[PDB]
Amino acid sequence: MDYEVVHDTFEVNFDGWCNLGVDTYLTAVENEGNNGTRGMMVINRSSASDGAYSEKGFYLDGGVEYKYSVFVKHNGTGTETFKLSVSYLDSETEEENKEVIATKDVVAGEWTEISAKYKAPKTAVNITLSITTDSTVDFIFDDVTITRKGYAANAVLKDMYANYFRVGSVLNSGTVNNSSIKALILREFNSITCENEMKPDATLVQSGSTNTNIRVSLNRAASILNFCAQNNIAVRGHTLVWHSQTPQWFFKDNFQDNGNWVSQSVMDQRLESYIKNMFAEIQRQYPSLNLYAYDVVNAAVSDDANRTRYYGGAREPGYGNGRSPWVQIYGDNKFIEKAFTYARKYAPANCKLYYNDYNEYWDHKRDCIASICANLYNKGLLDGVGMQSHINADMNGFSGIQNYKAALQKYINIGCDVQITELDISTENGKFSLQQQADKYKAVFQAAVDINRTSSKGKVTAVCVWGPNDANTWLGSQNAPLLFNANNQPKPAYNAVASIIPQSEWGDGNNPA
Ligand SMILES: O[C@@H]1[C@@H](O)[C@H](O)OC[C@H]1O
Ligand SMILES: [Ca+2]
Ligand SMILES: [Ca+2]
Ligand SMILES: [Ca+2]
């Protein structure tokens, strides 16, 4: 009754609402809202289960009671049976435990409301609200409202680094349900990458895709994109091309995983389409979202020095294991330029285009990456080099501060910018200490800051860590690679980094130059 958590009006963006059912379509329309404002029209259904949903893990806790409330409206003959269902997954139970929580017969032509009070089991999470009728009728909703009963530049990274670059992190579909993580990002980061949720296999749609219309979807990414847009955090798209996390069928003549490899001519179609539509859908669904960067091609250069010498950097043709289905089809890395051309053609001008890579400071590879990228920069096609920076706490050796600076500098010497895209600093299972860790973090931020304070053509425009805390890292906890412990308290790396910039220099992290 007292306090509000979700107010979805639909004025600008789809507010994290997605088609329930693979062929159900969603579209926001001007003046079909409640009170002639903007509204969310659900078309092409197929069953009473088909509909629309929104995962609201960010705002709805287990074991709290919520006022759920939606204005709906239809346009058929006679009356309609509208349902409001809350589902979840339970951290124990571990199956999608559903529940219909309000029924309401609703007549043609009229902005009727629907509601109910509901409490989820003490434990539940990854909630989710969804709207259906007992028929297969088009409908419209607006004003989704959920409620429960009951410049000062700050000591935060984004403010601290406001005059330098964006300081980012990573959300995923697990973390997007964590109270204190939400609090953390809001407090500290002004950039977010989707860990998995905007990769090809999370966004392509098999069913009725075609060589010149590749069906795509932001459903997986939606809660993330919505939370960032609503809170003015920018976003790096990640990633359009990658030998990995991309389903095989995308490469096959009959959109089967076990098909036949398609012509080049055919992949040019499928590639262009995926990119075009992928930009279309963002623009369409989340236009207020600041899409400031995108990883156009990801990790396309071999780690094998034999391949960087003779084969331009081409990975081995094939699928899985670190083989490239792209190289499989195209015979080599010609496809990189192609992809950056489509990207350039459809990306918003404010969204800068990056080649993203790891082991980016290992000489034979570094040289390869940098050659490629300079060539693209000079052609108007690339804007920046993405240094993934999966390094360790060692001040020396392979990913050591010298080899690191060397690459950084060599990249910047291209003209283009550089971003530090997926930074983590591995204690190699306790081999190094949280201090030698701190020292390395402090060193990296420091090297970025130097570049920025020098020339000038190129700049480091963002520095983002691959995860929010040590409890959510693809490297495993045992390597405590991040700035925050499993309880979100700052680690020694956090202040090492929290003190490179003097208070007289902080800024609006919500408005960073
Ligand atoms: O997508 C990320 C990729 O860019 C990096 O190479 O490896 C970790 C992945 O999550
Ligand atoms: Ca809105
Ligand atoms: Ca509205
Ligand atoms: Ca598959």
CA 47/CA 490 separation, integer angstroms: 50
- Given a contact cutoff of 8 angstroms between Cβ atoms, the answer to whether 275 and 216 are in contact is no
Radius of gyration of the chain measured on its C-alpha atoms: 24
Distance in angstroms (rounded) separating the CA atoms of residues 34 and 386: 45
Q: What type of residue sits at position 115?
A: S
Ligand nearest to the CA of 387: 1
Q: Which ligand is nearest to the CA of 244?
A: 1
Tokens of 145: 């409202």
CA–centroid distance for 421 within its chain: 12
Query: Does residue 390 sit in helix, strand or coil?
Result: strand
Provide the experimental method for this PDB entry: X-ray
The tokens for 225 are: 């994109």
Residues 6+ apart with CB under 8 A from 224: 171, 172, 173, 176, 192, 194, 197, 235
CA of 188 to the centre of ligand 2 (A): 24
Cα–Cα dist 498/511, whole Å: 19
3-state class of 437 per DSSP? helix
Q: Name the phi and psi angles at 269, rounded to 5.
A: -60, -65
State the Cα–Cα distance between residues 65 and 147, nearest whole angstrom.
9
Residue 241 DSSP label: B
Q: Can you tell me the distance from the alpha carbon of 235 to that of 503, in angstroms, rounded to the nearest whole number? A: 27
Nearest to 204 by CA among 38, 22, 446: 22
Q: Which atom of ligand 1 is nearest to the CA of 239?
A: 1
Neighbours of 92 (CB within 10 A): 7
Å from CA of 498 to ligand 2 middle:
34
248 CA to middle of ligand 4, Å?
7
The strand pairing partners of 65, in sequence order, are 119
Q: Where are the alpha helices (DSSP H) in 104-221?
A: 157-160, 179-188, 200-203
366: left (phi over 0), alpha (psi -120 to 50) or beta: alpha
Cα torsion through 213, 215, 216, 220, rounded to 10: 180
To 10 degrees, what angle do helices 363-378 and 334-346 make?
40
The CA distance from 117 to 255, in Å, is 45
- CA-nearest residue for atom 10, ligand 1, is 195
Q: Contact, 128 vs 53, CB < 8 A?
A: yes
DSSP label at residue 36:
G
Residue pair 250/270 in contact by the 8 Å Cβ criterion: yes
Residues at Cβ < 5 Å from ligand 3 ion: 9-10, 33, 37-38, 142
Residue 255's alpha-carbon distances to 146, 172, 207, in angstroms, are 41, 28, 9
Task: Tell how far the Cα of 16 is from the centroid of ligand 2, in angstroms.
Answer: 10
Structure tokens, 178: 């964590």
Ligand 2 ion: nearby residues, β-carbon < 5 Å: 11-13
Please state the atom number of ligand 1 nearest to the C-alpha of residue 299: 6
Give the number of the atom of ligand 1 that is nearest the alpha carbon of residue 421.
4
CA angle 285, 342, 375 (to 5 degrees): 130
Report how far ligand 2's centroid is from the alpha carbon of 28 (Å). 11
User: Residue 436 and residue 428: Cα distance in Å, rounded?
Assistant: 12
Six token digits for residue 337: 């330029």
Cβ neighbours, 10 Å, residue 306: 9
Cα–Cα distance list, 398 to 92, 345, 392, 402, 427 (Å): 43, 38, 9, 9, 14
Angstrom distance (rounded) from CA 72 to CA 113: 6
Nearest to 172 by CA among 469, 498, 493: 469
Question: In whole angstroms, what is the distance from residue 381 CA to residue 341 CA?
Answer: 6
In whole angstroms, what is the distance from residue 157 CA to residue 423 CA?
15
Contacts of 357 (CB under 8 A, 6+ apart): 298, 299, 300, 301, 365, 369, 385, 386, 387, 388
> Which residue is closest in CA terms to ligand 1's atom 2?
195
Pocket of ligand 1 (CB under 6 A): 298-299, 356, 358, 388, 422, 474
SS (H, E, C) 478-512: HHCCCCECCCCCECHHHHHHHCCCCHHHCCCCCCC
Report the alpha-carbon distance of residue 287 to residue 343 in Å, rounded. Answer: 18
The separation between the first and the last C-alpha atoms of the chain, rounded to the nearest angstrom, is 41
Report the CATH architecture of 2-152: Sandwich (2.60)
Q: How far is the CA of 245 from the centre of ligand 1 (A)?
A: 10
Residue 99 backbone phi and psi in degrees, to 5: 180, 120
- Which residue's CA is the closest to the ligand 1 atom numbered 9? 195
| Under 8 Å between Cβ of 86 and 57 | no
Residue 173 Rama label (left phi>0; alpha psi -120 to 50; beta)? alpha
Query: Which phi and psi angles does 144 have, rounded to 5°?
Result: -80, 120
Q: Where are the beta strands (DSSP E) in 9-107?
A: 18-20, 26-29, 39-42, 51-54, 65-73, 80-86, 89-90, 100-106
Distance CA 385, CA 461 (A): 11
Sign of CA dihedral 384, 385, 388, 392: negative
Task: Find residue 120's DSSP bridge partners.
Answer: none
Answer yes or no: are the C-beta atoms of 366 and 360 closer than 8 Å.
Answer: yes
Length of the chain, please?
513
Structure tokens at 133: 């009728």
> Could you give the 3-state DSSP secondary structure of residue 412?
helix
66 SS3 class: strand
Measured from the alpha carbon of residue 143, the closest ligand is 3
511 CB contacts (<8 Å, ≥6 apart)?
A: 162
Distance CA 221, CA 424 (A): 23
Which residue has tokens 């691959």?
Answer: 466
Pocket test for ligand 1, best of 298, 389, 482 (most atoms within 8 A of CB): 298
Residue 283 Cα to ligand 2 midpoint, Å, equals 14
Q: Is the backbone peptide bond immediately before 456 cis, with ω within 30 degrees of 0? A: yes
Residue 489 Cα to ligand 2 middle (Å): 33
Domain coordinates of the chain in residue numbers? Answer: 2-152, 153-513
What are 387's strand-pairing partners? 357, 420
User: Is 1.10.3720.10 the CATH classification of the domain at 153-513?
Assistant: no
Asked if 147 and 1 count as a contact pair (C-beta separation under 8 A), the reply is: yes
- Note the resolution in Å, 1 decimal: 2.8
Closest listed residue to residue 418, CA positions, set 389, 440, 380: 389
Centre a 10 Å sphere on the Cβ of residue 284 and count the other Cβ atoms it contains. 15
Give the position, in ligand 1's atom list, of the atom nearest the Cα of 358.
6
Q: CA 17 to CA 24: how far, in whole Å? A: 12
Atom of ligand 1 nearest to the CA of 298: 4
Give distance in angstroms: CA of 329 to centre of ligand 4. 18
